[PDB]
Amino acid sequence: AQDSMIEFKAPNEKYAITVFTDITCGYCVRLHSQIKEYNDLGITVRYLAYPRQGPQGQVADQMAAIWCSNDPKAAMHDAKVNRKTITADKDIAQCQKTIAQHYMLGHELGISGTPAIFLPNGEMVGGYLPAPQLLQRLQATQ
Ligand SMILES: [Cl-]
Ligand SMILES: [Cl-]
Ligand SMILES: [Cl-]
């Protein structure tokens, strides 16, 4: 559950967000291209998979290969910012279960689009926000 996330830990973290993402979403790519901006403002980003196709389509298999790569952080970047095909380095059957569990969690929480950003207090941002505006949203809520 809370142990199958891909975490971009921010030095001197002041806030931590949970992001349901989809590698095919143009704004999830925009969000991932700004991870350094998030960390520089003290925002830790933790990724959860949510293929809008569904937990068994071709997007879920690509995100399963990301979670099953020897370096999932580099696999996420090559898939989002570079549109490169990711091949699983470990048994993809392990990660296909994780992707399906991540989708079931996002469906349980009731998200309706990606990226789904959850704040520490539980509130949700309905899409991508740059690091400055996201920091302002966190300071106003947390
Ligand atoms: Cl990690
Ligand atoms: Cl599906
Ligand atoms: Cl289980």
**DSSP letters for 40-100:** HTTEEEEEEE--TT-TTSHHHHHHHHHHTSSSHHHHHHHHHTS-PPP--SS-HHHHHHHHH
- Does 68 qualify as catalytic in the annotation? no
Gap from CA of 73 to ligand 1 centroid (Å): 7
User: Which one, of 100, 122, 136, lies nearest residue 14 by Cα?
Assistant: 136
Nearest ligand to the C-alpha atom of residue 1 = 3
Domain layout of the chain by residue ranges: 6-141
Whether 28 is a known active-site residue: answer: yes
CATH 3.90.78.10 fits 6-141, yes or no: no
Of the candidates 34, 37, 32, the one whose C-alpha atom is nearest the C-alpha of residue 49 is: 32
β-pair type (124-125, 6-8) = unpaired
Ligand of minimum distance to the alpha carbon of 50: 2
Instruction: Give this entry's resolution in angstroms.
Output: 2.1
116 vs 102: CA distance, rounded Å: 12
Experiment type? X-ray
Cα(19) to ligand 2 centroid in Å equals: 20
Report the C-alpha gap between 65 and 73 in whole angstroms: 12
CA of 71 to the centre of ligand 1 (A): 9
| Residue 119 DSSP one-character state | -
